[PDB]
């Protein structure tokens, strides 16, 4: 919620990259359930989360 607050109102999707990173820290890797949970908590379509996860290297999908 602090990370989301660090962005302009109405553009919560900007928090997708850090929020997903948080899902990494408490899980080591990123399961698809974490992907969908990030999508839910960020009110963003799951496909965009999948895209940003597969694009950037640091996100461990396995």
């Amino acid at each position: 919620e602090a990370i989301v607050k660090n962005y302009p109102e109405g553009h919560k999707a900007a928090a997708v990259l850090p929020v997903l990173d948080l899902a990494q820290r408490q899980n080591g890797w990123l399961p698809i359930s974490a992907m969908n949970k990030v999508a839910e908590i960020l009110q963003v379509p799951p496909m965009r989360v999948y895209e940003v996860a597969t694009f950037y290297t640091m996100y461990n999908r396995k």
């Binding site: 999707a13 963003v44 379509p45 496909m47 965009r48 895209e51």
Partner: protein, 129 residues
Amino acid sequence: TQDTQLIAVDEKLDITTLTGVPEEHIKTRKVRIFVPARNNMQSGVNNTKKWKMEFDTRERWENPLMGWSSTADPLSNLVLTFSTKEDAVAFAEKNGWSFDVEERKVPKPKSKSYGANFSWNKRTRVSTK
């Protein structure tokens, strides 16, 4: 112009008796003046710049021996091209063919803008690239 006792022939031109077309194939047919629509499979409009005249499709049965598309309509694969609608209708009336001209549809000029993809207040902001 033409000095040979140039005669007034005001009545409309008609060569229905000078074409050899049989009785059946000159009024029971209905030509169609139209600008062909762009093939939605492609994205090129070079085939939508010339008017075309075509005849109504008729019976097309299967050949008993092999199964070909047998037909008995001579004016089935004959499609004329025309630079303008008026010339096409002039040809249709000249040959005595009933027509139904469709106006040429034109893509309405849109308003494209790259910036709208990344708008700040509007809903046109894209969620992906």
